[PDB]
Amino acid sequence: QIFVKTLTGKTITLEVESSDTIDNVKSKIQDKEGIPPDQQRLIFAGKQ
Amino acid sequence: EVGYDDIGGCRKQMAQIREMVELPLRHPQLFKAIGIKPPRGVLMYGPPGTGKTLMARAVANETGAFFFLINGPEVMSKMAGESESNLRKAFEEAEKNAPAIIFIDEIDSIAPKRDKTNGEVERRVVSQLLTLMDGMKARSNVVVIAATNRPNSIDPALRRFGRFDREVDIGIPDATGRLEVLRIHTKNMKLADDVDLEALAAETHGYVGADIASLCSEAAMQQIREKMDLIDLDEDEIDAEVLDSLGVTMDNFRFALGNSNPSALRETVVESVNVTWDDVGGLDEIKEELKETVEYPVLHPDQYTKFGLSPSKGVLFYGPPGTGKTLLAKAVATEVSANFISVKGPELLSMWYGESESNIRDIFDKARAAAPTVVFLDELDSIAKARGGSLGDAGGASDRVVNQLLTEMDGMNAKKNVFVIGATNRPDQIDPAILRPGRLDQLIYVPLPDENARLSILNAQLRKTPLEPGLELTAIAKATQGFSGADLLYIVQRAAKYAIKDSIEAHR
Amino acid sequence: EVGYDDIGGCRKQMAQIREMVELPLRHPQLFKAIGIKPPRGVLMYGPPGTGKTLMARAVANETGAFFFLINGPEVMSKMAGESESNLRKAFEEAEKNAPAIIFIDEIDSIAPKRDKTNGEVERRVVSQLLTLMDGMKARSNVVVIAATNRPNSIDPALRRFGRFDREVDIGIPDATGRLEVLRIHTKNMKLADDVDLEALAAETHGYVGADIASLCSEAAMQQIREKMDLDSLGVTMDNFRFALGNSNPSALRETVVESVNVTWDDVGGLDEIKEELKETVEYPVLHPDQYTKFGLSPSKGVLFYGPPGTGKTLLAKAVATEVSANFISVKGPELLSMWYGESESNIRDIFDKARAAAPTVVFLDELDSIAKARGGSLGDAGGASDRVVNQLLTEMDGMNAKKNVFVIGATNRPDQIDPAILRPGRLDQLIYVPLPDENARLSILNAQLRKTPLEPGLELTAIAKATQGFSGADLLYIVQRAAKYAIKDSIEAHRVDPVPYITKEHFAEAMKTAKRSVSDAELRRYEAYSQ
Amino acid sequence: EVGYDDIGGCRKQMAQIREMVELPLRHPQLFKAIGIKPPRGVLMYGPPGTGKTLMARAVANETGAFFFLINGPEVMSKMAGESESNLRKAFEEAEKNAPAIIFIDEIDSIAPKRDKTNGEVERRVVSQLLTLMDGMKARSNVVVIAATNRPNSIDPALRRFGRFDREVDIGIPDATGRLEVLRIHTKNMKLADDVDLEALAAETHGYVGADIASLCSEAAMQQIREKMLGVTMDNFRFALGNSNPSALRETVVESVNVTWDDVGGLDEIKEELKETVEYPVLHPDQYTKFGLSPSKGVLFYGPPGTGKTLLAKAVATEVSANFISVKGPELLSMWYGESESNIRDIFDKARAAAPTVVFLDELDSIAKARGGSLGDAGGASDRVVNQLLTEMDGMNAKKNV
Numbered sequence A: 001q002i003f004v005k006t007l008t009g010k011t012i013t014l015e016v017e018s019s020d021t022i023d024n025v026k027s028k029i030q031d032k033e034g035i036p037p038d039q040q041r042l043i044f045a046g047k048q
Numbered sequence B: 001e002v003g004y005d006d007i008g009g010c011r012k013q014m015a016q017i018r019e020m021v022e023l024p025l026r027h028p029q030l031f032k033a034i035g036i037k038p039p040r041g042v043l044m045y046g047p048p049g050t051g052k053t054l055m056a057r058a059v060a061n062e063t064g065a066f067f068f069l070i071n072g073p074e075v076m077s078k079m080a081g082e083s084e085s086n087l088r089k090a091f092e093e094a095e096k097n098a099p100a101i102i103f104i105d106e107i108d109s110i111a112p113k114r115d116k117t118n119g120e121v122e123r124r125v126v127s128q129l130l131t132l133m134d135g136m137k138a139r140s141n142v143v144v145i146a147a148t149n150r151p152n153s154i155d156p157a158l159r160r161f162g163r164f165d166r167e168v169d170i171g172i173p174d175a176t177g178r179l180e181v182l183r184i185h186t187k188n189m190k191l192a193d194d195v196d197l198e199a200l201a202a203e204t205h206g207y208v209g210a211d212i213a214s215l216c217s218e219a220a221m222q223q224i225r226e227k228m229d230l231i232d233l234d235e236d237e238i239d240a241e242v243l244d245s246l247g248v249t250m251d252n253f254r255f256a257l258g259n260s261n262p263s264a265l266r267e268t269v270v271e272s273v274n275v276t277w278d279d280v281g282g283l284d285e286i287k288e289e290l291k292e293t294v295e296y297p298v299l300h301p302d303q304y305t306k307f308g309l310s311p312s313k314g315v316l317f318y319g320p321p322g323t324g325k326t327l328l329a330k331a332v333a334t335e336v337s338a339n340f341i342s343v344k345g346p347e348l349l350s351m352w353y354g355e356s357e358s359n360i361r362d363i364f365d366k367a368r369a370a371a372p373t374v375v376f377l378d379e380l381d382s383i384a385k386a387r388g389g390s391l392g393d394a395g396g397a398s399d400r401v402v403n404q405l406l407t408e409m410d411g412m413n414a415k416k417n418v419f420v421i422g423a424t425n426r427p428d429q430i431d432p433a434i435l436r437p438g439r440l441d442q443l444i445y446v447p448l449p450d451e452n453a454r455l456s457i458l459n460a461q462l463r464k465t466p467l468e469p470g471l472e473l474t475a476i477a478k479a480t481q482g483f484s485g486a487d488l489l490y491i492v493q494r495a496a497k498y499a500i501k502d503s504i505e506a507h508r
Numbered sequence C: 001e002v003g004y005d006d007i008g009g010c011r012k013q014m015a016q017i018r019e020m021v022e023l024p025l026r027h028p029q030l031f032k033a034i035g036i037k038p039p040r041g042v043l044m045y046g047p048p049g050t051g052k053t054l055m056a057r058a059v060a061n062e063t064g065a066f067f068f069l070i071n072g073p074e075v076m077s078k079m080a081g082e083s084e085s086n087l088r089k090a091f092e093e094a095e096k097n098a099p100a101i102i103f104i105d106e107i108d109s110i111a112p113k114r115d116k117t118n119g120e121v122e123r124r125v126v127s128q129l130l131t132l133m134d135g136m137k138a139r140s141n142v143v144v145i146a147a148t149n150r151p152n153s154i155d156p157a158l159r160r161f162g163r164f165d166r167e168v169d170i171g172i173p174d175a176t177g178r179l180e181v182l183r184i185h186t187k188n189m190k191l192a193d194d195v196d197l198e199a200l201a202a203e204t205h206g207y208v209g210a211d212i213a214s215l216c217s218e219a220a221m222q223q224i225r226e227k228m229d230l231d232s233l234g235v236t237m238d239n240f241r242f243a244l245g246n247s248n249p250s251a252l253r254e255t256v257v258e259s260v261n262v263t264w265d266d267v268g269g270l271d272e273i274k275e276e277l278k279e280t281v282e283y284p285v286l287h288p289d290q291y292t293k294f295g296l297s298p299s300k301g302v303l304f305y306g307p308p309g310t311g312k313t314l315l316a317k318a319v320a321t322e323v324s325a326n327f328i329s330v331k332g333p334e335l336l337s338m339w340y341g342e343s344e345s346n347i348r349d350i351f352d353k354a355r356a357a358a359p360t361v362v363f364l365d366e367l368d369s370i371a372k373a374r375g376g377s378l379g380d381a382g383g384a385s386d387r388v389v390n391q392l393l394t395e396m397d398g399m400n401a402k403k404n405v406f407v408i409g410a411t412n413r414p415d416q417i418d419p420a421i422l423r424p425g426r427l428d429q430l431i432y433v434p435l436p437d438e439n440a441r442l443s444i445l446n447a448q449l450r451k452t453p454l455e456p457g458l459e460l461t462a463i464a465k466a467t468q469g470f471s472g473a474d475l476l477y478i479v480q481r482a483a484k485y486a487i488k489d490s491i492e493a494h495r496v497d498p499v500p501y502i503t504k505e506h507f508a509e510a511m512k513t514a515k516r517s518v519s520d521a522e523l524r525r526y527e528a529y530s531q
Numbered sequence D: 001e002v003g004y005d006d007i008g009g010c011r012k013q014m015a016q017i018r019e020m021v022e023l024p025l026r027h028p029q030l031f032k033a034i035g036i037k038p039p040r041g042v043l044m045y046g047p048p049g050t051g052k053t054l055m056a057r058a059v060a061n062e063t064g065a066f067f068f069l070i071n072g073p074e075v076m077s078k079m080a081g082e083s084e085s086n087l088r089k090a091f092e093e094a095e096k097n098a099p100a101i102i103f104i105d106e107i108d109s110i111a112p113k114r115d116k117t118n119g120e121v122e123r124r125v126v127s128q129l130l131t132l133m134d135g136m137k138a139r140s141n142v143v144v145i146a147a148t149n150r151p152n153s154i155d156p157a158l159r160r161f162g163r164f165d166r167e168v169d170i171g172i173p174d175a176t177g178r179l180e181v182l183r184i185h186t187k188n189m190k191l192a193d194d195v196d197l198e199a200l201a202a203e204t205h206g207y208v209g210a211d212i213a214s215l216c217s218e219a220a221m222q223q224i225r226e227k228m229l230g231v232t233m234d235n236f237r238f239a240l241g242n243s244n245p246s247a248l249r250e251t252v253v254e255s256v257n258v259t260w261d262d263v264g265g266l267d268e269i270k271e272e273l274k275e276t277v278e279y280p281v282l283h284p285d286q287y288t289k290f291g292l293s294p295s296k297g298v299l300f301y302g303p304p305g306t307g308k309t310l311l312a313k314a315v316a317t318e319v320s321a322n323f324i325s326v327k328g329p330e331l332l333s334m335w336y337g338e339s340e341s342n343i344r345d346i347f348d349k350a351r352a353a354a355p356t357v358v359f360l361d362e363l364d365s366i367a368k369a370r371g372g373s374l375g376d377a378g379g380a381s382d383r384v385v386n387q388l389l390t391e392m393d394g395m396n397a398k399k400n401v
């Protein structure tokens, strides 16, 4: 004698986006980070 | 190019859209010294292809400016924040070549409501368009155009003061507007000297404009298919005397008028059962009373406007079962010029919470989009249930789905000549608020047929029969006293079943 | 490859799709000479198992144009804007080489109604499809077609003039619409000379596009199975009848019935009822041209309202295996639900599925619990129980086409049925099965056993003239009690009879415990009508 | 590993699934030049606990070909996409290197009916499952095999000829199909020969193969707990007690004492109940020799306190058939749709036992003869009496209930 319909809701999905690109890490691998307090880098020469 | 002449009808709404795209561009000194320029945004809503995607194509060729277009979800890509930037550089592209005109299409994916999205990038694109529309305030700017259906699903922050406050409705042409559609769409075609363009618009009453183009396409193909003489398949050129044009006749438009199928009721197509106003014989004063109350507001809509009175709509059928009253609704399926919508009782009832009241709200909107039409509600006892004494026996709010039908029959707006027909066998279990002249005017009662009525009942069913040498049918009428209309169908079916049995026994 | 000759059935629906994807491409000088530009593609729909997903294979070879395949959920990816960019990079791929055609298989997945969904990417992929078919200028010569099976769960803006012109319906084939179907599904196969393709098409009703293709596969598999005991083989219509036992249920798989049969000879006495029920289902099927010549619809509904025990609830078991029609069985209130919902849709999905497998014979048993509508709510009977009848009243006659659906009803109380169902068009043939008399009972006792040695020299006429006022299954109790005493005199130590020789001594004590089921007071309620 | 002998215990349904995938591979020259493609999709269904998860591993060793395997809901991951592409990764990997056998499991949870659910992922999982089974000249190498217990919950478009046809029914093995299960998982165990194994074939009847493996596992734990070596009957007879088949686990009855000696005097009534439930069980060949159906059960009526709740307790502990007790009007409920399926699954489990006996106490409460003639009580609940009316004889065939 009793009736109930339902309640709705439940399933949802999400999207994800990507990171920067190919050529930013191509340029991120070619730079400097700094001198921590005081160091040197390079002073050399070769083949006479 | 499409120009000014391609838009069919819509003259009361063309004059609104002309003054906001032409007069700031043609006369820029007119808006000076009278204050600032009011119109900078517009939104066209309604059915989607009634002349909203053509209006953007119209202003691209009759208003010379640096025009470009914005589609739907084409601004989305697999980057970080580029989705809010490429539409920013699209607006900046329109302003670096100022003066220009900008059109964005289908803002359902671009600008949805902020409460429906949940933590994704789509809630920032609607916020990006909200900032750049009103923050960009230079001199002689661009005017945005939105041509999108479903206007109630738009966030109300996009209508505050400056995003768009000049939204317009491209209305459905009901009378003498679809004639201006047919004058333009058949101008490029070379019609034969048989069609009547006023008769094609006066027979039907509810179209959408785009289906009028669907009417001429199927009428053009049926004339080619009738004149399809395929003898030379490799040479594939149909001349038969000379390089000529076949055209289209009046009979080809009558064939396309049969399978019209408008877009408002494409999901609510009825089974085309043939009727010719002669399947019912016993009803001679209630059938013509049914035809005059459904034709007079739709065939001659001038006398009701002259008197100033409301038209009559809404009729209920009640009586004993087996004598018409649902198969009379079969007679108005293909015969009347209004479209038919059939409901087989609780077929539109759903098991979800808000879906059962939403499946009854939109069929009436499909009856509202289709200009004047008739709907049919068979077995209203399954819908009404007298609105009294639930006490848990209703359970799933069976009296609350009735209250949705309370407000749709009388209507909060002006009535568009829709016709509701209810058919049932018991008038006592119907709620008495259904029986009021605001919704159902008269309650006609079909009686049991007498001897004069049931004689022409047997003449109605014996129409297409390979009859024997004839016998009198008045003797069968005086013997079958007090029977319904379906009871006499059983007698002619039993007599026909004996006519099949002896024919097989005669063979071998 | 497949061609247009390799696809049979809907020849009228074949030509309306051939003049649209081939005739504007092969014959382009008609549209520019007279008339408007040629319209766009159609939306194919219908029941599953028809050749909607094998019609598009024929236009991919013989047309010669560039074909691009786009499946339904194939254009889907977890990025934010590649679910619509992959869709638009394929339609512009077909624009590079005009003309070209695009088949959207299963369009129901990526095009629902936009008002039903909320907060997904699926409302974006349909709005991309809105501006892709008829955009601003991006439509020159490509024609895009689609195939599905649910046209109602599509947005109505997608079936406009710009996107989808006609809704072509590949429907259920009929006689000489399913005969050329079996001819092309048997062309390459090695067949014998005794096969008759015309007789196989008359006994296949629900067999539409693939069940009839299952019939040529299961009969060939049975021919392989018998050949396991280089060498040529061939079907000989013995495995075709063996494959005809279980090859129908594509749509009616949920309501299959198995496997009881009485082969029309286990019932007796009702000689007039057996012929009346036979010609009500064999006339619209075996001779359909006689009814269209006379121009009258046949009679369908029959109802049984006899007393309990005469043979009404398994007379439907007699027609379930004898006549060539689909059988749907409903055992009482087996379709009711509690959800304000599915209890009403269970009648709806059982009739159009039966109408799809036309012709068919449905069976509604014990309609006393189904047809309680005129009293409600009767205190504890429960309200909203008359809607289950009003849905049934709109399916028997309603507003529908005549699909030769035969309704058989069996009940024991004729006064508790809705009189709205008791009318012609729904239930016209009202037959009252009585108790068997002395004439019917002698044809009842021998037809019940049919498999037992009966001690030749006995007389069953003495039982028929005696035990008056007994039902048909009341005599089932006597022969079951006699077989009970027959094995009681045989389960002892056999070290007694090595033969099933039931004698009169087993029938002696069987008549002692034989009691009458139908009382005299309950008999008068059936004789009170006398109509 | 398992094989064709380890799966042995079904005969008619075994040869249908074996020649479907091995005969086109061991003998491919007979299909060629025959005009018909081989069948391409297996769908085996039945009651739970049968070997629909272990048939696929059994011919996933004996053919010697490229087996695979997909679980049910692990393919459903949260992306807008890849719930259909991980299905594509399982099919495009299985395309190359002919031949091909792929097994998909749990097709009742995933891929439901289209118009009966509301989830936007579920509209795309069903059709991607369709399109990879027939696309644009697809189905050239792969052979799909399904396994489920609810065939009515799957999509009606899924059981077509191109994707899932020649479906095989894996039912309850009792007519010398139960005895073949005993000889498989006992040849690996140590069995001291003191009894016969053929008497155990007719002791219980609702066993579905998986309950037989639980029967021999109960005797293994009973053997080691009394030696705190082989196996004996006393562990198996203790396993014969509290047997509890998986189809009848919801309704238990084995809690009463020893009977058949607590009653006396009504020996002609006690012998009559032995003549109606022990005769087809012990002697099934005598009924088919006469070619007649066996008799039905016994209805009790009389004075209160005579012993009619003890005669139900007498047959519950002595005869070999299963027992299901209904405690008065127990199955009656408040819901409208229920008390019709609640009286149905008891009879559905009764026909799945093959054979058994059910008991309905106080038939005044469950019959309520006719509500049409009943107006003073105001009940009018004729649904529960008519569904009971069509479940005993009804429309279906008899299975010795």
Ligand SMILES: Nc1ncnc2c1ncn2[C@@H]1O[C@H](COP(=O)(O)OP(=O)(O)O)[C@@H](O)[C@H]1O
Residues within 6 Å of the ligand: B006, B007, B008, B009, B010, B047, B048, B049, B050, B051, B052, B053, B054, B147, B181, B208, B209, B210, B211, B212, B213, C134, C160, C161, C162
């Ligand atoms: N004035 C007009 N009356 C009727 N139909 C028109 C008119 N102008 C354009 N159409 C039709 O509209 C279609 C193109 O625009 P449409 O699809 O209606 O756009 P939208 O759906 O964006 O409103 C074509 O079928 C065209 O024939």
Ligand SMILES: Nc1ncnc2c1ncn2[C@@H]1O[C@H](COP(=O)(O)OP(=O)(O)O)[C@@H](O)[C@H]1O
Residues within 6 Å of the ligand: B279, B280, B281, B282, B283, B321, B322, B323, B324, B325, B326, B327, B328, B456, B457, B458, B460, B461, B485, B486, B488, B489, C397, C423, C425
């Ligand atoms: N004189 C008649 N007038 C109308 N219908 C008739 C007549 N004679 C026979 N019929 C047929 O009898 C049937 C009666 O159905 P109908 O009265 O609509 O059903 P219901 O009893 O459910 O209201 C229809 O098929 C109708 O065409």
Ligand SMILES: Nc1ncnc2c1ncn2[C@@H]1O[C@H](COP(=O)(O)OP(=O)(O)O)[C@@H](O)[C@H]1O
Residues within 6 Å of the ligand: C006, C007, C008, C009, C048, C049, C050, C051, C052, C053, C054, C055, C147, C181, C208, C209, C210, C213, D134, D160, D161, D162
């Ligand atoms: N003309 C035809 N008549 C009947 N069956 C056909 C016909 N053409 C193809 N089929 C069958 O249809 C199936 C392939 O297409 P189908 O699965 O029906 O596609 P879809 O489900 O997409 O409509 C095969 O079983 C094939 O035998």
Ligand SMILES: Nc1ncnc2c1ncn2[C@@H]1O[C@H](COP(=O)(O)OP(=O)(O)O)[C@@H](O)[C@H]1O
Residues within 6 Å of the ligand: C266, C267, C268, C307, C308, C309, C310, C311, C312, C313, C314, C315, C444, C448, C472, C473, C474, C475, C476, D393
């Ligand atoms: N002479 C008989 N004719 C038909 N059925 C019979 C006969 N004797 C016994 N039976 C069996 O008795 C049962 C009762 O059949 P029927 O009268 O249709 O149902 P009910 O018992 O509900 O009245 C069926 O199983 C039927 O096969």
Ligand SMILES: Nc1ncnc2c1ncn2[C@@H]1O[C@H](COP(=O)(O)OP(=O)(O)O)[C@@H](O)[C@H]1O
Residues within 6 Å of the ligand: D006, D007, D008, D009, D010, D048, D049, D050, D051, D052, D053, D054, D055, D147, D181, D185, D208, D209, D210, D212, D213
């Ligand atoms: N032929 C067989 N007879 C009886 N039981 C079997 C048979 N083959 C396997 N089993 C049992 O089935 C179980 C493994 O498969 P099962 O769990 O039944 O799979 P599913 O539930 O997927 O059908 C084990 O308990 C095993 O002993």
Ligand SMILES: Nc1ncnc2c1ncn2[C@@H]1O[C@H](COP(=O)(O)OP(=O)(O)O)[C@@H](O)[C@H]1O
Residues within 6 Å of the ligand: D262, D263, D264, D303, D304, D305, D306, D307, D308, D309, D310, D311
């Ligand atoms: N002579 C007897 N035979 C059977 N049961 C008996 C006897 N004396 C006492 N009892 C017990 O009395 C109870 C009543 O049994 P029964 O007559 O079946 O039920 P009820 O009391 O409802 O009539 C049971 O527990 C039964 O075991």
Ligand code: BEF
Residues within 6 Å of the ligand: B048, B052, B053, B105, B106, B147, B148, B149, C130, C131, C134, C135
């Ligand atoms: F202009 Be439509 F909405 F594509």
Ligand code: BEF
Residues within 6 Å of the ligand: B321, B326, B378, B379, B423, B424, B425, C393, C394, C398
């Ligand atoms: F279709 Be009628 F209202 F019985």
Ligand code: BEF
Residues within 6 Å of the ligand: C048, C049, C052, C053, C147, C148, C149, D130, D134, D157
């Ligand atoms: F493969 Be079809 F669309 F059922």
Ligand code: BEF
Residues within 6 Å of the ligand: D048, D049, D050, D052, D053, D105, D147, D148
């Ligand atoms: F028992 Be299921 F097939 F895993």
